[PDB]
Design a binder for this molecule. Structure first.
Ligand SMILES: CO[C@H]1CC[C@]2(CC1)Cc1ccc(-c3cncc(C)c3)cc1[C@@]21COC(N)=N1
Length: 368
């Protein structure tokens, strides 16, 4: 009933259908594990298919508070209020949630996209304008019997599933391996080892998490810290030396093209991230393929691994390989091989363990 409740377009994210107010107003809302506000278009911005009309809802309540949100890539400004919210292809429930009515924005909405809002699924600490503004999932858990858990199956070329309040076993193969949530703000995790085609980058594990590592469905790329990215590109270049590519390509400043149906996947290496496990000195590894990190542009592809100054971001390139369980009740994140992941006859995405790794806690970054 919740299976295939996500739709999308390549590089434009994944959205779920939601209803807001009384009578219900249907809206397509972007699923974002890297933010914590429920913010919807509330004015006729030309890129919008539809928007939330507060004057048409008898259950709308004004909080009489503004919210101004600049961010690296843009800005949004809204008016805070509460209303009745439901997910038609989710649990049979209605909650009173905080809604930020977007009244002004810049580089927020996408020209040609089918979503009109963002559902922030992370914790209160990162909510705007402060942690006193209760996020949607927290409201859903407080007002209903829905278990404090959700899982995501993002399927690359788009569709997928958001299982609210549970795990659907048919969406994954093999076993789920759990990594602890380091702190409840973003979905912060610890990377203890990085391998390119089984070859360790041999870096101080603190570099992998400088200044944080997060699981973010609202990001397309696998974002790596500058020093880690340099070492990863150097190794990927070496493993794929059988072909040449301008530098701009590895920088995402230009595209690479092959004649159709002939892309040389085997020349490209596998990428492995070892994550902190449940028990002391134990890790597991997640492995992704060039099918995840080479993103088709509509056979032309973009290198979807990029430099970052905000730490590791496990975006859509990571998540598309895997069934991801956001186990909020147990403060952990589960990973299992996705039954919908894109692969070939030679290599498959993998979740393997246990491994023995020492000093895993030394890998977290802490402000001096
Ligand atoms: C509280 O205000 C926050 C500020 C930051 C944004 C969310 C709301 C704003 C925003 C707008 C669009 C997209 C997006 C565009 N295209 C494709 C994808 C997949 C997503 C992502 C985001 C952000 C920025 O990063 C994350 N994770 N969400």
């Amino acid at each position: 009933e919740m299976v295939d409740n996500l739709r999308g377009k390549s590089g434009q994210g994944y959205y779920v259908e939601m209803t807001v107010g009384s009578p219900p107003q249907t809206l397509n809302i972007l699923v974002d594990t890297g933010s914590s506000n429920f913010a919807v278009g509330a004015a006729p911005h030309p890129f919008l298919h539809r928007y939330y009309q507060r004057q048409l809802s008898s259950t709308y309540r004004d909080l009489r508070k503004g919210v101004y949100v600049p961010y690296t890539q843009g800005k949004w400004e809204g008016e805070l209020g509460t209303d009745l919210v439901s997910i038609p292809h989710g649990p049979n429930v209605t909650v009173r949630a905080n809604i930020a009515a977007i009244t002004e924005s810049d580089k927020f909405f996408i020209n040609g996209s089918n979503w009109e809002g963002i559902l922030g699924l992370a914790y209160a600490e990162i909510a705007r304008p402060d942690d006193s503004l209760e996020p949607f999932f927290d409201s859903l858990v407080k007002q209903t019997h829905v278990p404090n858990l959700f899982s995501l199956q993002l399927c690359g070329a788009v569709g997928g599933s958001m299982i609210i309040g549970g795990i659907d076993h048919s969406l994954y193969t093999g076993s789920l391996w759990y990594t602890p949530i380091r702190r409840e703000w973003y979905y912060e995790v610890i990377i203890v080892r990085v391998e390119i085609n089984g070859q360790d980058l041999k870096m101080d594990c603190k570099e992998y998490n400088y200044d944080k590592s997060i699981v973010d469905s609202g990001t397309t790329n696998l974002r790596l810290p500058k020093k880690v990215f340099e070492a990863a590109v150097k190794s990927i270049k070496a493993a794929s030396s059988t072909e040449k590519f301008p530098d701009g390509f590895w920088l995402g400043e230009q595209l690479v093209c092959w004649q159709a149906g002939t892309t040389p996947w085997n020349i490209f290496p596998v990428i492995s991230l070892y994550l902190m496990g449940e028990v002391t000195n134990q890790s597991f590894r997640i492995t992704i393929l060039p099918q995840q990190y080479l993103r088709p542009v509509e056979d032309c592809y973009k290198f979807a691994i990029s430099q970052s100054s905000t730490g590791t971001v496990m975006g859509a390139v990571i998540m598309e390989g895997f069934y991801v369980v956001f186990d909020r009740a147990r403060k952990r994140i589960g990973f299992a091989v996705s039954a919908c992941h894109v692969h070939d006859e030679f290599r498959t995405a993998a979740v393997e363990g246990p491994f023995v790794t020492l000093d895993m806690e030394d890998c977290g970054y802490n402000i001096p």
